[PDB]
Amino acid sequence: ARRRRAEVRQLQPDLVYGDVLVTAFINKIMRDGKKNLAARIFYDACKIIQEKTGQEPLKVFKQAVENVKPRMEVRSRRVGGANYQVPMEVSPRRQQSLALRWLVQAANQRPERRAAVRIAHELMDAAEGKGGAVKKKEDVERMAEANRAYAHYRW
Amino acid sequence: RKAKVKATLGEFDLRDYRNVEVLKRFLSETGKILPRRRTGLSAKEQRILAKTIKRARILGLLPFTEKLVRK
């Protein structure tokens, strides 16, 4: 983006709950344009969630994002010697986006044999405060105030 | 034009190296002799003042240097 600021894509609302966040997540699950399979892996994972907790999966979902959303991170700057690892606060969107990505990426790590489950579980675990979804949030946030000695080379 | 010390004063003797109450006003928060910009003084005046303050400091009446108090 060198001339203009790039204008965020407006997503279509979800076909079951209406929350655009649902869809954003879905897309991140799918691969190779296989949107149907994705939705199925999402919505079936809701069923397991609606099953093993009783409450509403939409909200366990909308909760498991706050608990992976990193309040700030480290970016990179090079000054006059080499590259001091600089801290810097993370925007509205970049948080939401980092979250969905991380949820999926580490959901896919879990030992569970089937996809829908793997999503369901990570989407549950993290919704509480455990599981390598948060531990990769509690990681990027760790280095945020572990290199705060270099927090004056800001932009 | 923050405030010119030529105006806030009547007439005085620039060669008077004892008139602390006057001289005092041509120094900064530090002992530093104000710039002609803030003194409003003539070209000739400032050189005269300059010597008078030096004379008076040496006499013990005006300070060589101060210390800046964060006010």
Binding site: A149, A151 | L68, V69
Partner: protein, 115 residues
């Protein structure tokens, strides 16, 4: 051992390192701290964070000697001179005054090649 009501916090910041000693109202030092004492090695001592540390520990050791209030004297241009202050300011010591007393020669010793 002693009990010191009010006192002085001297802050001497280099480009290389920031030292903070705390003294009695007669100026005799009680406890001090620096960036290296915090436990930093080289380049890292001269840092607005290292300095925020040096100050905090300085007042930590201090309020254990009963310290309550302090007048502050900073000598020097340098990083986190300002941080050292604010660190003191919001440390739990009431900050009576701040002054700068950085020694400016009235034109004396020829300085080293790199000035």
């Amino acid at each position: 051992k002693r009990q010191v009501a009010s006192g002085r916090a001297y802050i001497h910041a280099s480009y290389n390192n920031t030292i903070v000693t705390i003294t009695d109202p007669d100026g005799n030092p009680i406890t001090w701290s620096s960036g290296g004492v915090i436990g930093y090695k080289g380049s890292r001592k001269g840092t607005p964070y290292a300095a925020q540390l040096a100050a905090l520990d300085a007042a930590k050791k201090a309020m254990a000697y009963g310290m309550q209030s302090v007048d502050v004297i900073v000598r020097g241009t340098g990083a986190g001179r300002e941080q050292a202050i604010r660190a003191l300011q919001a440390s739990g010591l009431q900050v009576k005054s701040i002054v700068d007393d950085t020694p400016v020669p009235h034109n004396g010793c020829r300085p080293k090649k790199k000035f």
